[PDB]
Assembly symmetry: D2
Homo-oligomer: 422 residues x 4
């Protein structure tokens, strides 16, 4: 029964053609949904009660579009998101962090606009986790956004939105200085011929997967759901293909900001992503990611590939990793393991931000500390296991891979352990 579920007959195929031939509509997904969902907040999804339903439906990142609305309007949206998120904090083993992303208005006819400088300052003051920077055309645009965030915004992730020909052509220099990329298909589809957007999307997703940096697919993914309860055949196909392409995140704009079915749009992205993730041809994907990833003498990078290799060898249910900044979980995510990456962190901001990396399930650790560092490490690993059991990730008898470091503080991950559950 285990080998008939989650497209495992198609996963064992010797060629990609045979993998496609073996895909089965009766093979049910079992793994937790890996691709994060970004939902845009607006009049249709601003109330605390509506936000609670969206969190239950699968929303991982809340997007605030600063192209519309005042600072007062967005501050109320942030407060409502935080109230809805904290309403589930009573159960620490099941609590779900939700990131807050600020999407800038952009340069307009201008580099960094004066309104963007004020909006970025607002983001820092309100503790946003991510900035989706509009119309990034070159590396200096990213440096300007970084400078506008100031010293208090050093920890905020900058996701550069590629929306025109110049951004596509200067992609490599933009990716090098950014934390990640958004394929902003709305403007991109007006700036370049509509029939070429898929080439830009597939190229950017491939390059981000090679670099090990998050990539978001955005705009008109479930467009018809703004007025209809069910999407078109092209829309379900688009969501599935963005996941198959390698997108870390998928996004909803008008579907959740102003549409009549915001919760149903989130539920639809969740259902499609789970089916598409099981249909990923890991046999070729892992080999190519492993071959293309450069040789490294960084112990976190070395431990990450050893852990992902070990996970595939034993069909590990999960890789439990301790992380301060999210980096150790990001380096595991870049190899696209089938095993869920359960990231245990004390940083509330890192827990929200790791939603940018596919297959990372953040667990915010709020248990009392242990006096002995080694006991504190062991307790965080046990917390990951207990949360895993509660959420359905793990069962007694499963094997897990545990990734830890030799001393406290970020940057010292160097250990991988094989553990039998209970």
């Amino acid at each position: 029964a285990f080998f008939q579920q989650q497209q495992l007959p198609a996963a064992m195929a010797d060629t990609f053609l045979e993998h496609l031939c073996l895909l089965d509509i009766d093979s049910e997904p079992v793994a937790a949904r890996s691709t994060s969902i970004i939902a845009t907040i607006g009049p249709a999804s601003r109330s605390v009660e509506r936000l609670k339903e969206m969190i239950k439906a699968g929303m991982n990142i809340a997007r605030l579009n600063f192209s519309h609305g005042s600072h007062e309007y967005h501050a109320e949206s942030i407060a409502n998101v935080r109230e809805a998120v904290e309403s589930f904090a009573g159960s620490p083993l099941s609590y779900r962090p939700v990131a807050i992303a600020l999407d800038t208005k952009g340069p307009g006819s201008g580099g960094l606009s004066e309104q963007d400088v004020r909006d970025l300052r607002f983001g820092v003051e309100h503790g946003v986790d991510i900035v989706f920077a509009s119309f990034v055309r070159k590396a200096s645009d990213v440096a300007a956004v970084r400078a506008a965030l100031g010293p208090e915004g050093h920890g905020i992730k900058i996701i550069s939105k590629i929306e025109n020909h110049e951004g596509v052509k200067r992609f490599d220099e933009i990716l090098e200085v950014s934390d990640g990329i958004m394929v902003a298909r709305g403007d991109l589809g007006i700036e370049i011929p509509a029939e070429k957007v898929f080439l830009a999307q597939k190229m950017m997703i491939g390059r981000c997967n090679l670099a090990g940096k998050p990539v978001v697919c955005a705009t008109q993914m479930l467009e018809s759901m703004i007025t209809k309860p069910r999407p078109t055949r092209a829309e379900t196909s688009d969501v599935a293909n963005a996941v198959l392409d390698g997108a870390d995140c998928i996004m909803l704009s008008g579907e959740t900001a102003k549409g009549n079915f915001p919760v149903e749009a989130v539920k639809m992205q969740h259902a499609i992503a789970r089916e598409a993730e099981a249909a990923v041809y890991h046999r070729q994907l892992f080999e190519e990611l492993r071959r293309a990833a450069p040789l490294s003498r960084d112990p976190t990078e070395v431990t990450a590939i050893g852990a992902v290799e070990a996970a595939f060898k034993c069909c590990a249910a999960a890789i439990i990793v301790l992380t301060t900044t999210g980096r150790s979980a990001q380096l595991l995510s870049r190899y696209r393991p089938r095993a869920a990456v359960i990231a245990v962190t004390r940083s509330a901001q890192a827990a929200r931000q790791v939603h940018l990396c596919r297959g990372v399930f953040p667990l915010l650790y709020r248990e009392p500390p242990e006096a002995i560092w080694a006991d504190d490490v062991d307790r965080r690993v046990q917390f990951g296991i207990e949360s895993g059991k509660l959420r359905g990730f793990l069962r007694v008898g499963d094997l897990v891979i545990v990734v830890t470091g030799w001393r406290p503080g970020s940057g010292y991950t160097n250990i991988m352990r094989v553990l039998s559950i209970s």
Copy 2:
């Protein structure tokens, strides 16, 4: 010899990549497509696309197959649609540069446990009006195909049966259905209501993969450019859906309400043409050809053996085209199954085969009507030269290009066994 400009166009840097990941990383929006569009476009005929003048614009935009939906309209209405399509097609007979055959496909209303009374009458109408293809609705098992085949009377055994897979049973019994069908249509409208909407992409990719493995045509259908029924431009999901159906391996893509009742039928055809050309250049031929070669069983049929040798030869020299002589279309279909980058120019004396080969990706039919030569070798040479002269006129070929030529050792269908490399003079 060819120049650096040649190797920068049609995604050739991405085509030479050693891995699929590197292939994706090398896709370039500035690398322009050069080859003729190989995935056929099926447009549904209705009130928005029925007039002769509107049909001429749709043919110019790229329509290759006209679909008649027998779920609506009388026999009289459909006979007039057929007459209008034929009048629009024949209006280009005076110019070899613009003349193109257009297939006529009859899409049945559907079943009841099996073949309905209305379907028997509509299939008889198809035979009497000389339709080329039948898109059989709600095919659930092999016996449904046998019933459609039987209903094609004594006169319509040459009509192609494309089985529409629209429910759970059709997906589960896919192998037995494909074995007896000429091809398949992934009918996503009903399929997306019969099975969970989030599983349709799995059924689509599986069926396209199995049809590619079997060497039989597969059509992707329904809601591909849906918003274009009322809007002049499609959504980002719609352009993505068209491109991904071509990348998946679909031989044909379809338009339903977009051309039958929408406000922008011609623009919807133009959009599918533009996307298909971009997607065809982005196909990763290096792995695709290797996997088609490895999965296809060994064969002692000379047509199959010649076809793989010809496709291999075409890749070796970047051949502009593979010119094949065919009476039934079968030799061109066996070349098409290996997905060559070179256009397959099929020279035939059969008007029906010329229309039907639009079902196979990359086949460009040329109907030949010269009186037969007394010396057979001279008749063959005249047809090969006709494919070369049509290719030069249409922009496929230039003097100095290499072409692969596929013929047989004697007249009559079934003897293809020769592949030749010719330098265009």
Copy 3:
């Protein structure tokens, strides 16, 4: 180039030109062959063990010391010739020569003693002389038995029974020497600790032109099973009378290593020949060249794809450790082992990194020479009061011996493999350490 650019800048272009690294990084086997370079010098310690047959030309303590220095790892006693008294003296001389280097524990080299049986002769199974010789082996503490003319699984059960309850730790390497042994190979390998491709008799029992097929098949199946395989007989035959081998002989040794042999053997070349030390030196020189020429990129991918999925933590840790070693060009993998099993599971994935096995068992230290790339370090210190401290001391002993022997340098990355509790069977940890 992008996959090696940062490490080329850090380690230097000279590092990536040595040990056939351009050939090892090639994308195809054809390109791997085209990139093999006679100017690319081997740097790693020799990983394929050398078995030398003891006889009149290699029996003295002084001669044995030179053979140990030349590279002999396993001493073979051929019980087809000589009395029990003769073989007991050979064993005593080997042990005296080996223990002459024991003064320095950070550099000491263990040497295994293998007993090669006379065989069944015209009989159907275990002969009476073999029963007596196997009892002699147990009484004299031999490490390995090379069982002659093994034709079926019941032959190895008979050898095991003849070793008795005191010889349970002795490794049984079945010699395949005839058509029946080749045909029943799978059942024989299943119950054996390893195999010897005994080409002398095999080349008379089956057509001489088919021996290479049997050799390559048996080596491939042993590599797939993760069990040691020995290539034997006439490898450097002409060196029995000449100081230099023929072109076919050097080719044969190189190809046995490339095929995947864990051990290579010398028979008449060391037992009665005029150049025993030179024959060992020649096998050592060829094996280091051939080990560097192994196409690890495809070999590791195929060993990974063919090896079944496993829920054994030692197996899971071993593949993760070998993967980690390749990622950073690790100089070595240091493993703690009681029986040798954790080092054997690392060896089956054919890492380029040396497997430094720290053990308290003198017998396991001798026996691990059967597994390619395992360098045994015998730890003699009494246990620390705290088990975690005792484990740490053994890892540090491996690092310090590694630095002393030239295996490790300051700045190198090393992979360390340990377990969660004392006793054999609990290896489950892989650590990445930077050498200071």
Copy 4:
């Protein structure tokens, strides 16, 4: 049949990995294909008798090597006469006649920097006596090859120059030497004294790999069966060395003292024949063909394009043979470079080309002696029929087998462009 797929290591040939290919090798799986790696036997006192030479031809000798390091011109002229007498003694049966090449192996430069005066005289003797190949000793750079070519003069333009790599400089300048040579010999005797003995296998495998990539012949030479100079059976290392040279990709294997001065010249030829046949069946064609195809550059030469199409077609149908018509041997060489499992039966009127194609693995030359038919197409057909009849007599072909036939569009060398699938009747 199941029996067909159990022979010639076909279970190991279908394996998905090289490791599984090795695990499936079976000593009971008998070779069926004709031995494709040519055997070069050195002529000396043990192999100069006309009667002894007839036995060596029957045992499998394809090329006779004359070592000009020993003996006068008078001695070599008598060796040539004896070889030709033994070869022509079988010319009364044209369907089974076996051509045998004559190669002149030069003394070398000695202490000099380039072409010696004795080599100039010996090369002129070779041209005057019609030798087919020159094995040029101690080639260290491209200018050494140009000097040999100049010494052969205008009458020796058709002689093949195989450069012997025997020292460090020759290995380091390998690429420039191969570029101007017809092929290479890995001369392991001197190479094993010029560089460390333990490094010779690296130089051998590298040179064979580079020659296979370039599509040029490579010979493995010296001490392959050394002990057979005095003993009736070789050592285990010697049989292994011969098998591994064939597995490495050598087009030819050589015997020196084993045939020139030993007591078992015929048995040494028989031993190389037996081992080569076993090793050829053990070649992992699945990865070999894929890598040769991928590494071979794109080409606009019709002979090159036809060759890859023909080899691909042969593998698709398990063709028993590829029958090719050739004037210079070039069309057969281009088929050989793709290492087909099918025998390449080369039909030629050039006695010199028939002898020289023995340098290319898997090429079986057939010398056609009939004068030309008045109708060129009939002359082509008669030569193809001669190939089929010779193939049936020699055991290459049987009724029911499929063959690939490679011909050209006009008479004369350089115009191969046609591949045809033929059923043997």
